[PDB]
């Protein structure tokens, strides 16, 4: 009867006919957030308890969950639907059944994807329009009002991978359309906010160079070089180094080819996430030593030594809560939870979080896995 909408890209929002509806106390809001994050999938009661109270649930935690569900159903009933259908009780747990496009993140995902296919086809004006639409879905810090809940941290961090990618693809499209000069200012702002993001620097350096500002381009490379050296102790990657070498030689750039090539790569990623049926493929962690396969079943897959983890690794050197893999709807990103021994992807220690690629080697202490995005063909 009335429009139901939800928001994760900023403070948690539930809106009915465009009017925000306050969704309860922080614990109740965390229930809603968990359900929206896992929209159209069941969330177990045990998972809800861990998210709300991590280490110290009260003795009546389950009664509280039942109350939160009842409360949330009353709120949902204001949209004139059957709350028991929309927020249904699984014997597994609870499931919020909502269309993807009724969630701000769902719209972000859809627009980004449309922008990818457009750029891959050389339709850069349209790609830029879709990317503008995606970025408009962001209101503020992810689940800003629930920042004191631990589950928010890896999820919010993962979604920055996606936002940065969208900013970069937007810059590429604009540059491909001949508007390099008009994106310099935003890129300057973005490289300050995200100083270690080489793809953003790549686009800024490109934009200077194609705006007849060669010396500024070279100066920007020197700046990121110093930043990466001093702050992180690393050299710039091959993409930055190759760009620098072209500019030093006053060689031409092909911004249209670049934007097409990036998009084509992303289409490959989109393909491996999708089955012939159109449903998302289930990503797996395969243990190399044992052959045991661990499906990623929720938005967040928690890994550690403690029994409450989704993937439990018994070794003494593994942290109680060691890592989390987050499915953003666009990428899988692994997060190191300030573990004693760290997380190693493709045989190097990760700094905070990295986006996972299909077939990546993942090491947690002595445990070694293959991360597979593409659907399995044997079992």
């Amino acid at each position: 009867e009335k429009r139901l909408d939800f928001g994760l890209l900023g403070p948690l929002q539930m809106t009915i006919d465009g009017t925000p509806v306050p969704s309860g106390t922080p614990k109740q809001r965390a229930v809603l957030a968990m359900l929206v994050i896992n929209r159209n999938r069941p969330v177990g009661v045990d998972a809800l308890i861990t998210a709300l109270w991590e280490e110290w649930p009260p003795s009546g935690a389950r009664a509280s969950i039942h109350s939160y569900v009842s409360n949330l159903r009353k709120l949902l009933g204001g949209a004139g639907i059957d709350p028991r259908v929309v927020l249904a009780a699984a014997p597994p747990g609870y499931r919020l059944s909502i269309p993807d496009n009724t969630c701000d993140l769902g719209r972000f995902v859809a627009e980004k994807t449309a922008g990818v296919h457009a750029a891959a086809a050389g339709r850069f004006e349209q790609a830029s329009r879709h990317l503008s639409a995606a970025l408009r879905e962001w209101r503020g810090p992810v689940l800003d009002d629930l920042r004191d809940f631990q589950f928010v941290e890896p999820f919010a961090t993962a979604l920055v991978e996606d936002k940065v990618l969208a900013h970069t693809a937007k810059a590429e499209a604009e540059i491909a359309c001949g508007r390099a000069s008009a994106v310099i200012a935003e890129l300057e702002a973005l490289t300050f906010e995200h100083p270690y993001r080489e793809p953003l620097w790549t686009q800024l350096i490109t934009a200077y160079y194609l705006s007849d500002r060669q010396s500024d381009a070279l100066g920007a490379y020197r700046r990121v070089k110093t930043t990466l050296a001093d702050d992180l102790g690393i050299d710039p990657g091959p993409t930055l180094r190759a760009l620098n070498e072209r500019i030093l030689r006053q060689q031409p750039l092909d911004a249209k080819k670049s934007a097409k090539t990036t998009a084509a790569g992303t289409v490959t990623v989109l393909d491996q996430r999708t089955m012939a049926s159109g449903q998302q493929a289930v990503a797996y962690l395969h243990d190399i030593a044992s052959g045991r396969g661990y499906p990623l079943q929720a938005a967040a897959t928690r890994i550690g030594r403690l029994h409450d983890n989704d993937i439990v690794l018994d070794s003494a050197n593994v942290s109680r809560h060691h890592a989390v893999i987050v499915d953003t709807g666009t990428n899988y990103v692994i997060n190191d939870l300030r573990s004693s021994n760290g997380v190693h992807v493709q045989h190097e220690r990760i700094r905070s979080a990295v986006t996972l690629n299909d077939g990546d080697h993942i090491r947690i202490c002595d445990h070694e896995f293959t991360f597979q995005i593409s659907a399995g063909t044997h079992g």
Partner: peptide, 8 residues
């Protein structure tokens, strides 16, 4: 387990 993590 809730046992202190061993160091590498």
């Amino acid at each position: 387990s809730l046992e202190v993590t061993e160091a590498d």
